[PDB]
Amino acid sequence: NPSARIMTFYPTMEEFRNFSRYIAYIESQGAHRAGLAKVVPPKEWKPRASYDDIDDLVIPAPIQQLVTGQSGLFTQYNIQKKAMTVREFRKIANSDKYCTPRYSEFEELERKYWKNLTFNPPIYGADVNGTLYEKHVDEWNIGRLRTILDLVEKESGITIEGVNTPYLYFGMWKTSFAWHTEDMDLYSINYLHFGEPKSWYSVPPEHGKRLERLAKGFFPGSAQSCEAFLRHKMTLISPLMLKKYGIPFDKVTQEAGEFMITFPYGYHAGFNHGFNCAESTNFATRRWIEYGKQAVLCSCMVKISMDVFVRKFQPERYKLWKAGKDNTVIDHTLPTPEAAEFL
Ligand SMILES: O=c1[nH]cnc2c(-c3cscn3)nccc12
Ligand SMILES: [Zn+2]
Ligand SMILES: [Zn+2]
C-alpha cells in the first residue's frame, strides 16, 4: 500500500474554520484512499474549557465486551450492564483489574491486546447520547456539522441516534470496535476529548471487497445468514491475520485533542488504551451519494431513503435509478467534486 498510508493534517485556524472545505481539501491530497485520516486542530482551539463537571453524567447502557475466539479470529458479544455514572466507570477503568498494562512501546501494548482480548472482559461506556462541546464552539462541532446529511432531517424530520446526532464513548483498557464501515457507507468524525489514546486499523476502500471475501471465508455461517454480517460490529480480525492473507492495511494511534475522519467504505477497527472519552457522528459530501445508493445493508437496521439526495444532486439519473437501471461504477481513488477548487 503506497497511497493507502494514513495521512495527518495540521490546519491553521483560518483553514480549520470551514469543516466541509477542509474535507474537500484533505481529499484533494488523497486522504480518502487510506480510508482513515488524522486532523490535528490548531493549539488555540478547545471544544470545552474543562472536563471536571462530567462525573455525575450517566452512561445508561454500559456494555461488557465478551470476546470468543483463537488464531487471530474473534467474535465480540455485548452484555448490557446497569446504568452507571462517569465517576463509577473511571473507578473501574483505573482499578488494578482493568487498568492499562506496563509497556515499553506501542508494538508491545498492541501485542498484549491481541494476546489478552478473550480474558478479563472490559466495560465500554458506549453509545451515550450527547456532546461535550460548549454551546458557542462554531468550528468542527460534532453536534452541528452542516453537511448535506442535514437533508435527511430537513426534508423528513427523521433523527438517527449517532448517525445525525452525536454519541459519546467512555472507554477503558482493551475496550474495542470491530471491523466495519459506517451506516449507509457514510463518513465519520471522531474527536478524543481526553484520556489515554485510541489506536485504529484501516483497510483502503479499493481493498474493502477483499476484507469482505476474507471475513466470508472465516465465518461462512454468518455470511449465509446475512450478506452484510460485518455491519453487526462483532468481527475482530488480528493485523497478523490480514498480513497473512495479503489484505493491505495501516495503523495509527489517535491521542487526546485529535480528530479521526473515516471515509465512505473505509473499513476500520481499533481499541482503547485506557480511560478516555471520544465524541462521534456521521456526515456526507456529494461523493457519498453514490456509496449510499450502492451500500450493501444488513438483512437480519439503519436505512436512509436515498430518493432526496438523488432528486437534489442527481436529477438526470433519478428516472434510471428508480427503474434499477443505474449501473454507475464507483472509483474509490477519486476525490469529492467539492475538491475542484484545490485540484
Ligand atoms: O472508538 C470507537 N468506539 C465505538 N464505535 C466506534 C466506531 C463506530 C461505531 S458505529 C460506527 N462507527 N467507529 C470508530 C471508532 C469507534
Ligand atoms: Zn466507525
Ligand atoms: Zn445482518
Per-residue buried b or exposed e for 35-55, using 16+ beta carbons within 10 Å of the residue's own CB: bbbbbbbeeeeebeeeeeebe
The Cα 51–Cα 195 span in angstroms is 11
The Cα 162–Cα 50 span in angstroms is 24
Q: 80 burial class (0-12, 13-18, 19+ CB within 10 angstroms)?
A: exposed
Which residue, by CA, sits nearest to atom 2 of ligand 1? 177
- β-pairing, 7-9 with 36-39? parallel
Contacts of 263 (CB under 8 A, 6+ apart): 27, 31, 32, 35, 36, 37, 187, 205
332 annotated as ligand-binding: no
Residue in the block written with cell 444488513: 298
Is 162 an active-site residue? yes
Q: Decide: 262 and 100 in contact? Cβ < 8 Å.
A: no
Q: Decide: 109 and 174 in contact? Cβ < 8 Å.
A: no
Q: Decide: 76 and 219 in contact? Cβ < 8 Å.
A: no
Q: Cα(301) to centroid of ligand 3, in Å?
A: 8
* β-sheet bridge partners, residue 9: 39
Which residue, by CA, sits nearest to atom 13 of ligand 1? 177
Q: Decide: 106 and 114 in contact? Cβ < 8 Å.
A: no
Residues in the chain: 343
The Cα 134–Cα 52 span in angstroms is 14
Give the DSSP letter string of 4-37: -SPEEE---HHHHT-HHHHHHHHHHTTGGGTSEE
Is 280 an active-site residue? yes
The Cα 51–Cα 148 span in angstroms is 31
- Closest ligand 1 atom to the C-alpha of 183? 11
* H helix intervals, 119-171: 151-155
Query: What is the dihedral sign for C-alpha 252, 255, 261, 263?
Result: positive
Q: Cα(295) to centroid of ligand 3, in Å?
A: 13
The Cα 212–Cα 249 span in angstroms is 13
129 annotated as ligand-binding: no
The Cα 277–Cα 236 span in angstroms is 22
* Residue 193 CA to its chain's centroid (Å): 15
SS3 134: coil
Which helix (H) or strand (E) segment holds residue 127: the answer is: strand 123-129
SS3 190: strand
Q: After which residues is the chain broken (C to N over 2.5 A)?
A: 300
193 annotated as ligand-binding: no
Q: Which three cell numbers stand for residue 168?
A: 459519546
Q: Decide: 279 and 133 in contact? Cβ < 8 Å.
A: yes
Domains of the chain: 6-343 (2.60.120.650)
Give the DSSP letter string of 226-274: -TTGGGGS-EEE-HHHHHHTT---EEEEE-TT-EEEE-TT-EEEEEE-S
Catalytic hit among 32, 193, 207, 268:
268
Cα(first)–Cα(last) distance of the chain, in Å?
A: 23
SS3 41: coil
The Cα 207–Cα 209 span in angstroms is 6
Q: Which three cell numbers stand for residue 50?
A: 474543562
Residue among 128, 189, 142 at smallest CA distance from 47: 142
Is 88 an active-site residue? no
Which helix (H) or strand (E) segment holds residue 63: the answer is: strand 63-70
Q: Which three cell numbers stand for residue 230?
A: 460485518
- Closest ligand 1 atom to the C-alpha of 169? 3
Q: Decide: 59 and 101 in contact? Cβ < 8 Å.
A: no
Q: Cα(281) to centroid of ligand 3, in Å?
A: 22
Is 332 an active-site residue? no
- Within a 13 Å sphere around the CA of 328, how many CA atoms are in the beta-carbon half? 20
273 annotated as ligand-binding: no
Which residue, by CA, sits nearest to atom 11 of ligand 1? 182
Q: 58 burial class (0-12, 13-18, 19+ CB within 10 angstroms)?
A: middle
Q: Decide: 268 and 4 in contact? Cβ < 8 Å.
A: no
- β-pairing, 187-195 with 63-70? unpaired
Phi and psi at residue 171, to the nearest 5°: -110, 175
